[PDB]
RNA sequence: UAAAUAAAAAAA
């Protein structure tokens, strides 16, 4: 048996990080060419996410076909071995998961015009291999990368972030322990703007905190967005070098 | 089944919103008055917002707690839609986009938020626990289902009383309402849900860069206004000066400033609603006994 | 459960010479049916096979027929649902060679096999393998009774957990099921099951002649 | 992992040493572990200055002044024994091996308990965590006697959960102890080692039944992180002194931190030092006046909800408009109620009620006359509650369950709906009321010639407070027939009280304090004392007379099931402690030979210098006395019907039906006895009677407890609020505290040793001389305090260094 | 037989009603004729989608029986051949049981029949005739036949009955007995004495029902 | 709905 705190007077957290550090970010494009039109493998901390974009293609049922826009579908597979303690049941039908899937759809319905691929279907399959806090933000980044890899038109990037709050000051990018310890805010940010695609608060949060917490998240998300551009451009430079 | 709306209606209502006008003759920050009616039994509450009619029923029964939580009771919220609220709804459709959202908003507002003291639902640890159930019935629809439901669940829970219990280990005699009075369920806070609908002006001319058309945002939209909105926002606030939960999935992209303004506007509404809800709980509590003072011990 | 009546969920369940009988065409609900009862020693098995088809599938462009087999637990809940699906997949791998599929284009044949009972006696100081040849016997009878064209009579046998199905008078094999048991029983099991096949075959042919007469 | 961590600490010292070399600052590793000291002594890798704790202290310049504080002198941590096997239990039971007793925990040491056993004259002691084996006060327990090598005298130290093993924290190994506790433990052990008068000690091997109800407590701030919203394992201190603290896990640790909460025990396994429980509800803040009262009624298991609607129908259709019939022979009345024919008309009599100033529920009234034959006619009238409260009704059922009215300081809890208690059954003045009346015919020497009982209608001439009656008797201006009868009552009262005391009647005393309002009805002004007037003897003597006559009558009519009340003689062991000290200190003693010798020696326990001493001893004698107990006549034989305290052969409670349930039964039995109505078969069934007595003895006790704890609560607030100074007498001396009893409020408190001195470690305790010697705070001189010493006392807010709590403790002026 | 009903209370439905007998309160809604699902389609007649929601908890097999019996009453009432290949959704939300639902479903069924009929009337759907339903029970000692029994009367009953008749000619001619659901055991003399007294109180109810229908609806018409 | 040597008496 043990006990632990949140934020020490020395400005140190349970894992050793300070109040404003992003975890290790690794990004990966075109990971499954023979399985999808677009694919991305995300590593944000201990989080490991495979994202597959299949489409635009013919619908399997003509009943479900829109002549004005493409049909966008997202299925999140949170594996039974994503956490330390293996879950006995499947999480697929869980109301918490249905809300997550619904949330993500609502977010990107306004971010892709989805008016230039009529009579087609875009299927997005996601596999969460490992989970360690901020899984929603990582899900957002995985879809954005995979969609771009598929050459599917969109207006801008959508970057996802996780916020942790203790006392006066929130902690950027929370892990499971911190998530357990304190309420968190998940932010969907469009491009380099201040506009949120997704605002998600599931636990109690003082009303004074949010304005400042939002400010920290937006600044951090911009850094994340910059990294993503670097991640793809860098890969392109590396790929070109490999070709040479 | 897809509802049919005339192109003429879509142009009329949109243009009216640019002229700060709406069909039901309301304001943009105005919320339709909420009427709360209590039935004979405790936990029976009827919420009415204009034409919108919802009914909630609170019930409980002796059950055994989960292995993971031996000190906590059980609490579930049901919001199954039916064709009674309109033929647009499929019977038992509990996986549709709007249905799952609404189900998740209520859950994050009441269940997850810990509005109900589930620890006080335990009779004997790891053995017997009360199982409170909130059943929401969507009688008819004129929009604002999420707002109606949150009011309905909370008013019901605060209304509700559970038979008094004497516990001696594993044996408990549940006193009937005849034998002794029932006990009210514990509440930690009173969450209120506000729904915001966003729109686009579609107008050629804007008078100034400094002052602009910006974005259309109304509160508690009707059925006709709900079909034409380009964005959905639901913020839950209480009288404790804190945000219970807020859910924005996609829709029309908005600034962090705009969300705050909606959040601050909603706070003035949830204050009036909470006090009003308490008042109708006070009026119904004193209502029940014609002779209660004659009745009293203390 | 809002579909059936499962009762109280806080409760718990209870905690504690080859002979054949063949009958076909006793169900008027389907196109073909069969009853198979076998008693050996202290162990006996009674199962019912129901065949529905061939019925046309709307929009189907298949140039041949489509067979679907499902095993069910009639009374005793013993075999896992996962294992029932496995045998079903094994059974369909057999009759897709047996059934003349070229005869039923744009059509489908559904086969329901109800394992109403099996009785097992075990002494104290696989399992479903023994039922497999009886399932094959039942289906082949139910298909032949229904009017479905079969290239040959399908039959099988069980020897030390090794099941192998034969057609064309044991000259060829339409299915092979080996679980556990012992090694080097390849030649032996092939000879022992071939005898069970020929025995099951003649009784199956006689069955149709009897009822048909 | 232990060696890695020690290597980690050693690496830190190594790093700091190298890091601080340019500044000429060395590092000293203070460790008692032999692994680090050996690893540094060998000096394998780097040079690290390692010193043990004691070895480091001896390097300070002031070694002497800080040395004394320092202590001088496959492994499994101690554990409680497993509960005895059922087979072992039934084998022991049959062989004569085991007995079971109700454990009463001592009131100042939660780790000492006793169990009464027939075999043994004094209570058999059960001492310590282990031998107590997770019992709670109240539990039915099976015990085994320990060998005489293990027998102990009553402990000389006080203790609670808040102040024992204060280091430990609950969770859902290695153990260590504090220096005072260590030294305190040494002193206690020494006291045990040398004491004469050790007593039978046992140990708990099983529990027959458990007294775990819902309880009330407040969290240990010391176990809670007040600024963290996480779920927390924490310690709850219960409101009862005896109970061990409880470990509960709660999401709201920080929120509940100044709340008076309710919890329930779930288990107490061998391998946990404390019971585990769980949060039930929050009654509100610890200062809240209201919540303390609700808390009080829960702790006592007293119902106070509005009377069940079901009860109301039993109440009369016409409520406050109910009226005694004008003509008893009225025909409509006689149809609506046929028993009326048997009711007597006593209205012409001059009935008056003498009740306390805020008394609205008036039980009884009295009348007098001079008969032509020279003798006097004295009669007693009591509320006819059983006319309205019928057996088998919901109203009888709620009253029977409640068993008694409960009087708190600010509240009265009724047994019956107040339509009865304060209107229709109350013997209100100037209004015809039904009543049960017993009338005597006695001579001038107050000797009873005959006595009669009947159901009657009476009209109250006047309702007095006690004082008015005394003034009307005294003045000598009013010589009307009524006043002449009142004086006749007092004259006969003196005769009856004389004979009674000569017969061996006790004269105990406990005149508790009273509270008064300002012009506002809820704004309190003063604390005073109620004075016993001669009229008070006047009401009590006739209540006693009514109750004795009634008991004889109903036992006569129903020898098997009469509702009676007995009071056992105290064993000498009850007076063992009290008697010995007085004999030693003054060579003055109180005699246990009879109740008359007890009463007379008590009377003679006088200090000429101080009047109060006699009252001190009288209140202390009251504590010793065995509980009086309701019983049905069939349960015992006649000599055991004895009321010791009252020195009468047979007694019952009749005079207060509205506020007690025993009376209701006695009333029905008397109406049965006189042929007025048949007795309900309920009160003729021994099993039902036996269950009724069990319940009402329980309700009676609980009501006394609740009564006292309301007074203690208000008085405790009041003295502090006043800043007032009040005297106290020492009735107990331990090694680490004394107990004082206060005359004005008559409420005991514990002054703890470290609230009596800034230095405890220099104190002298003498167990033979009943003496504590210490150096007071705000003073420099050694002080001797003894038992029976007049002291002065007051209340102030102390914050405990060990317990982060700041309660309002009782101190010595 | 002091029932109370309201008509046209819901906005987003073709027809609705709220029937109340004693405690038992049921609200009903009817949409139709509308486009049916393929599995619902009937080539020549109207398809009925009948849903019953309980006052507490979710719909179980119990309500599935309430739906089935309610179907037996409403089916012959509606002139279904007027709406081929079409659908009519009928939803009943029981708001208050008015009885121990763990033991009885008598009053809820009768109230659902009356409410459904009223909702069909409000919706303007072709009906062949009129209809009324009442709950009946028999006492344990007295063996009296009580029409419209209370919850307390049901507890001490030996048999419970649901009777729904089909009326024509201004509510004077019993065209047929749409539903009789008797649970319990019976004597012939009691049955016809029940039917004789029951017919009288039913006829009084129709007269009252006609009054209510005219009073509310006439102000709407010209 | 079990069960004690668990504060005498009077009025509240
Ligand atoms: Mg009195």
Short mmCIF file of C-alpha atoms in Angstrom, two decimals, chain E:
data_model
loop_
_atom_site.label_atom_id
_atom_site.label_comp_id
_atom_site.label_asym_id
_atom_site.label_seq_id
_atom_site.Cartn_x
_atom_site.Cartn_y
_atom_site.Cartn_z
CA UNK E 1 -66.97 5.99 -13.05
CA UNK E 2 -65.83 9.57 -12.47
CA UNK E 3 -63.11 9.51 -15.12
CA UNK E 4 -61.47 12.63 -16.56
CA UNK E 5 -59.88 13.07 -19.98
CA UNK E 6 -58.24 15.74 -22.13
CA UNK E 7 -57.80 15.75 -25.90
CA UNK E 8 -55.09 17.26 -28.11
CA UNK E 9 -52.37 18.02 -25.57
CA UNK E 10 -49.32 17.13 -27.68
CA UNK E 11 -47.97 19.31 -30.50
CA UNK E 12 -45.72 17.05 -32.57
CA UNK E 13 -48.24 14.23 -32.95
CA UNK E 14 -51.29 13.83 -35.21
CA UNK E 15 -53.43 13.01 -32.19
CA UNK E 16 -53.12 12.66 -28.42
CA UNK E 17 -55.04 12.30 -25.15
CA UNK E 18 -54.74 11.93 -21.38
CA UNK E 19 -57.11 9.51 -19.66
CA UNK E 20 -57.39 9.37 -15.86
CA UNK E 21 -59.32 6.89 -13.73
CA UNK E 22 -58.76 7.15 -10.00
CA UNK E 23 -54.98 7.21 -9.62
CA UNK E 24 -54.35 5.54 -12.98
CA UNK E 25 -53.14 8.19 -15.42
CA UNK E 26 -52.13 7.33 -18.99
CA UNK E 27 -51.08 9.67 -21.80
CA UNK E 28 -51.36 8.44 -25.38
CA UNK E 29 -50.23 9.70 -28.79
CA UNK E 30 -51.12 8.70 -32.36
CA UNK E 31 -49.34 9.51 -35.63
CA UNK E 32 -50.82 8.27 -38.89
CA UNK E 33 -51.41 7.48 -41.60
CA UNK E 34 -47.69 7.75 -42.45
CA UNK E 35 -44.94 5.98 -44.41
CA UNK E 36 -44.21 2.50 -42.95
CA UNK E 37 -40.96 0.55 -42.69
CA UNK E 38 -40.58 -2.29 -45.21
CA UNK E 39 -40.99 -4.96 -42.52
CA UNK E 40 -44.18 -3.24 -41.32
CA UNK E 41 -45.84 -2.83 -44.72
CA UNK E 42 -49.17 -4.53 -45.34
CA UNK E 43 -50.20 -4.62 -49.03
CA UNK E 44 -53.90 -3.93 -48.41
CA UNK E 45 -54.36 -2.79 -44.80
CA UNK E 46 -52.97 -0.35 -42.25
CA UNK E 47 -50.03 -1.41 -40.08
CA UNK E 48 -50.24 -0.71 -36.35
CA UNK E 49 -47.16 0.15 -34.29
CA UNK E 50 -48.27 -0.19 -30.68
CA UNK E 51 -45.98 0.79 -27.81
CA UNK E 52 -46.62 0.70 -24.06
CA UNK E 53 -44.30 2.40 -21.57
CA UNK E 54 -44.45 1.61 -17.82
CA UNK E 55 -44.67 4.19 -15.02
CA UNK E 56 -41.48 2.86 -13.41
CA UNK E 57 -38.42 1.27 -15.00
CA UNK E 58 -38.07 0.27 -18.63
CA UNK E 59 -40.44 -1.71 -20.85
CA UNK E 60 -40.30 -5.45 -20.15
CA UNK E 61 -42.24 -8.51 -21.27
CA UNK E 62 -45.08 -7.30 -19.04
CA UNK E 63 -45.70 -4.29 -21.27
CA UNK E 64 -45.30 -6.58 -24.27
CA UNK E 65 -48.51 -8.28 -23.12
CA UNK E 66 -50.19 -4.90 -22.61
CA UNK E 67 -49.25 -4.07 -26.20
CA UNK E 68 -50.72 -7.36 -27.42
CA UNK E 69 -54.08 -7.02 -25.67
CA UNK E 70 -54.33 -3.36 -26.68
CA UNK E 71 -53.73 -4.56 -30.24
CA UNK E 72 -56.69 -6.94 -30.05
CA UNK E 73 -58.96 -4.00 -29.22
CA UNK E 74 -57.66 -1.33 -31.59
CA UNK E 75 -57.28 -3.56 -34.66
CA UNK E 76 -60.96 -4.21 -35.40
CA UNK E 77 -61.87 -0.64 -34.36
CA UNK E 78 -59.88 1.00 -37.16
CA UNK E 79 -61.07 0.89 -40.77
CA UNK E 80 -57.68 -0.41 -41.87
CA UNK E 81 -58.55 -0.99 -45.54
CA UNK E 82 -58.71 2.78 -45.99
CA UNK E 83 -54.93 2.95 -45.56
CA UNK E 84 -53.12 0.27 -47.60
CA UNK E 85 -49.33 0.08 -47.31
CA UNK E 86 -49.43 2.67 -44.54
CA UNK E 87 -48.49 3.02 -40.86
CA UNK E 88 -50.14 4.28 -37.68
CA UNK E 89 -47.92 4.74 -34.61
CA UNK E 90 -49.73 4.36 -31.29
CA UNK E 91 -47.75 5.10 -28.12
CA UNK E 92 -48.99 4.81 -24.53
CA UNK E 93 -46.99 6.30 -21.66
CA UNK E 94 -48.43 5.15 -18.35
CA UNK E 95 -47.70 8.03 -15.97
CA UNK E 96 -49.19 6.54 -12.80
CA UNK E 97 -50.06 2.90 -12.12
CA UNK E 98 -52.93 3.44 -9.69
CA UNK E 99 -52.32 -0.14 -8.59
CA UNK E 100 -49.61 -2.48 -7.34
CA UNK E 101 -47.84 -3.13 -10.65
CA UNK E 102 -46.04 -6.09 -9.08
CA UNK E 103 -49.40 -7.85 -8.80
CA UNK E 104 -51.86 -6.23 -11.21
CA UNK E 105 -52.00 -4.51 -14.60
CA UNK E 106 -55.78 -4.25 -14.74
CA UNK E 107 -56.41 -0.52 -14.44
CA UNK E 108 -53.43 0.36 -16.63
CA UNK E 109 -54.76 -1.74 -19.50
CA UNK E 110 -58.29 -0.31 -19.39
CA UNK E 111 -56.93 3.23 -19.17
CA UNK E 112 -54.66 2.53 -22.14
CA UNK E 113 -57.60 1.28 -24.21
CA UNK E 114 -59.70 4.35 -23.43
CA UNK E 115 -56.76 6.70 -24.02
CA UNK E 116 -55.75 5.03 -27.29
CA UNK E 117 -59.32 5.29 -28.57
CA UNK E 118 -59.45 8.99 -27.66
CA UNK E 119 -56.09 9.57 -29.36
CA UNK E 120 -57.36 7.82 -32.50
CA UNK E 121 -60.43 10.05 -32.44
CA UNK E 122 -58.27 13.16 -32.07
CA UNK E 123 -56.01 12.06 -34.93
CA UNK E 124 -58.97 11.72 -37.29
CA UNK E 125 -58.42 8.09 -38.24
CA UNK E 126 -61.22 6.01 -39.78
CA UNK E 127 -62.99 4.05 -37.04
CA UNK E 128 -65.71 1.47 -37.60
CA UNK E 129 -67.31 2.23 -34.23
CA UNK E 130 -66.77 3.42 -30.66
CA UNK E 131 -65.29 1.68 -27.62
CA UNK E 132 -65.00 1.78 -23.83
CA UNK E 133 -63.02 -0.27 -21.31
CA UNK E 134 -63.47 -0.78 -17.58
CA UNK E 135 -61.61 -2.82 -14.94
CA UNK E 136 -63.64 -5.17 -12.73
CA UNK E 137 -62.78 -7.21 -9.63
CA UNK E 138 -64.28 -9.70 -7.14
CA UNK E 139 -63.95 -9.61 -3.30
CA UNK E 140 -62.54 -12.47 -1.14
CA UNK E 141 -65.32 -12.68 1.49
CA UNK E 142 -68.18 -10.57 0.14
CA UNK E 143 -67.72 -11.90 -3.40
CA UNK E 144 -69.28 -8.67 -4.65
CA UNK E 145 -68.62 -7.44 -8.19
CA UNK E 146 -66.89 -4.06 -7.97
CA UNK E 147 -66.62 -1.99 -11.14
CA UNK E 148 -63.59 0.32 -11.28
CA UNK E 149 -61.94 -1.10 -8.14
CA UNK E 150 -59.32 0.76 -6.12
CA UNK E 151 -55.80 -0.53 -5.51
CA UNK E 152 -56.76 -1.58 -1.98
CA UNK E 153 -59.72 -3.54 -3.33
CA UNK E 154 -57.48 -5.38 -5.78
CA UNK E 155 -55.23 -6.63 -3.01
CA UNK E 156 -58.16 -8.47 -1.45
CA UNK E 157 -59.62 -9.74 -4.73
CA UNK E 158 -60.20 -13.30 -5.95
CA UNK E 159 -60.37 -12.38 -9.64
CA UNK E 160 -59.57 -9.41 -11.86
CA UNK E 161 -61.26 -8.56 -15.16
CA UNK E 162 -60.76 -6.24 -18.12
CA UNK E 163 -63.84 -5.62 -20.26
CA UNK E 164 -63.86 -3.63 -23.50
CA UNK E 165 -67.00 -3.45 -25.64
CA UNK E 166 -67.65 -2.20 -29.17
CA UNK E 167 -70.55 0.26 -29.38
CA UNK E 168 -72.62 1.54 -32.30
CA UNK E 169 -75.85 3.52 -32.77
CA UNK E 170 -75.09 6.48 -30.51
CA UNK E 171 -73.49 4.21 -27.92
CA UNK E 172 -76.57 2.07 -27.34
CA UNK E 173 -75.86 -1.11 -29.29
CA UNK E 174 -73.08 -3.47 -28.23
CA UNK E 175 -71.66 -4.55 -31.59
CA UNK E 176 -69.23 -7.03 -30.03
CA UNK E 177 -66.96 -7.75 -27.07
CA UNK E 178 -63.52 -6.59 -28.20
CA UNK E 179 -61.69 -7.88 -25.15
CA UNK E 180 -62.52 -9.79 -21.99
CA UNK E 181 -59.47 -10.64 -19.89
CA UNK E 182 -60.52 -12.64 -16.85
CA UNK E 183 -57.88 -13.82 -14.41
CA UNK E 184 -59.20 -15.82 -11.49
CA UNK E 185 -62.07 -18.30 -11.13
CA UNK E 186 -65.78 -17.80 -11.81
CA UNK E 187 -69.44 -18.49 -11.10
CA UNK E 188 -72.07 -18.03 -13.82
CA UNK E 189 -74.62 -16.07 -11.78
CA UNK E 190 -72.06 -13.44 -10.75
CA UNK E 191 -70.88 -13.02 -14.35
CA UNK E 192 -74.25 -12.01 -15.81
CA UNK E 193 -75.14 -9.87 -12.79
CA UNK E 194 -71.81 -8.18 -13.47
CA UNK E 195 -72.63 -7.79 -17.16
CA UNK E 196 -76.07 -6.36 -16.41
CA UNK E 197 -74.89 -3.75 -13.91
CA UNK E 198 -71.73 -3.19 -15.95
CA UNK E 199 -73.70 -2.34 -19.08
CA UNK E 200 -75.70 0.28 -17.19
CA UNK E 201 -72.66 2.11 -15.83
CA UNK E 202 -70.95 1.85 -19.22
CA UNK E 203 -73.94 3.47 -20.92
CA UNK E 204 -73.83 6.26 -18.34
CA UNK E 205 -70.13 6.71 -19.11
CA UNK E 206 -70.66 7.08 -22.87
CA UNK E 207 -73.30 9.73 -22.21
CA UNK E 208 -70.77 11.56 -20.03
CA UNK E 209 -68.08 10.97 -22.66
CA UNK E 210 -70.30 12.42 -25.39
CA UNK E 211 -70.87 15.49 -23.23
CA UNK E 212 -67.12 16.01 -22.75
CA UNK E 213 -66.39 15.54 -26.45
CA UNK E 214 -69.00 18.09 -27.53
CA UNK E 215 -68.10 20.69 -24.87
CA UNK E 216 -64.39 20.85 -25.73
CA UNK E 217 -64.63 20.45 -29.51
CA UNK E 218 -67.60 22.72 -30.31
CA UNK E 219 -65.77 25.97 -29.50
CA UNK E 220 -63.19 25.01 -32.14
CA UNK E 221 -65.78 24.47 -34.87
CA UNK E 222 -67.91 27.15 -36.52
#
